[PDB]
Amino acid sequence: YTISHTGGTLGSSKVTTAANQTSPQRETAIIGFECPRKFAEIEYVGQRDSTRFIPRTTESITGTAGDDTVVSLTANIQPVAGETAIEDQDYPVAVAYNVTQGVQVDIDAVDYAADEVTLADNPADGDTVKVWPIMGDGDVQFRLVNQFGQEEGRVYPWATPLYRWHDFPQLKRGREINLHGSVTWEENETVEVLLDAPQAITWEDSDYPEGQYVSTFEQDVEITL
């Protein structure tokens, strides 16, 4: 006797784990989904139940004369759903915020190739601005952990690239992501979502304007009770 649910950034309980990786090119555990006492079991079926991932990183710049262009963001950028115009995407490629004025900034233009952008707000000298663009390169996959602290194993050991999550219109049916493999939980067990990449994903940065979370991870699943 089962129904469906979503596991997510917050999800059915505040016992999940939300951390960030390292810059040395060595994978870490971004997220930890631990089961509660409430439910007997959680089950995920690749090819059946969708998954969504909006990753996003953090950068910073200092203000000075002519500082309307933003440099290479250390990030292999792509457009969203293959579409470039920020005003016509399912979600922004990137956003930024002046701290000295304490507001959001709109973006004017892009160079996907050079990984650079162009803004309207020429800041002052000594100014401070922060940017949250989507994450580029990255290899992700799932992992299981028992109630002890042990790696039982991965799932379908072929890590998908990060950028495919950006590449498609994730909301539209048929194009949504359905990874592979299968997996089952239990009460004190903890699945983890793991990632390897150069750049530091972030969350819960207060200065972000369009929500209390820069970036999200969601997953449809089936549940016993």
Binding site: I3, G211, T216
Partner: protein, 173 residues
């Protein structure tokens, strides 16, 4: 001068302005307060077959959309209006709902996963789990459109008055 004999299963869709559905301005992070309360019409039965769409066009008082990471849940409750735990038809987020065409393209529509059945008194509640930072919920500037009764896509909501054996099996709750 005939009317045409019509099936009493009237296929419609549902919204907030109707006088059996009440709204409630929500604070930041009260996921147990119901934003909307659908009371039965006091004389009919509603049926919602599985595979049924939703369009919960939610915004704030200033009119911007809520946070995409919001959780949105539809749930049947008892005759008192307390959640049954089980009996959910929907559980997903707002980011999964492109407001521009969430009710336009079947290729974008979000559908139900369960059947449902509401009597003259049974109650549905729409709950919203939000972080702290958001700009609440202004029902005066937001709305809901459950189902479609207009297009050759999607599905509708059946409403019926009382027929004998249907009621006999309907009281098998």
């Amino acid at each position: 001068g005939n009317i045409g004999n019509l099936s009493a299963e009237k296929q419609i869709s549902v919204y907030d302005g109707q006088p059996f559905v009440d709204e409630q301005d929500v604070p930041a992070d009260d996921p147990n307060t119901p934003a909307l309360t659908i009371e039965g019409p006091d004389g009919y039965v509603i049926a919602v077959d599985a595979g049924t769409p939703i369009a919960p066009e939610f915004r704030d008082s200033n009119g911007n959309k809520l946070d995409p990471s919001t959780r949105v849940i539809v749930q049947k409750c008892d005759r008192q209006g307390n959640p049954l735990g089980d009996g959910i038809v929907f559980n997903d987020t707002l980011g999964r709902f492109d407001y521009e065409q969430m009710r336009t393209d079947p290729d974008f529509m979000r559908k139900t996963a369960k059947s449902l059945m509401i009597d003259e008194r049974e109650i549905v509640k729409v709950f919203v789990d939000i972080p702290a930072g958001a700009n609440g919920y202004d029902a005066d500037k937001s709305r809901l459109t459950l189902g479609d009764d207009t297009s050759d896509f999607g599905k509708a909501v059946e409403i019926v008055d009382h027929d004998e054996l249907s009621d006999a099996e309907t009281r098998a709750v």
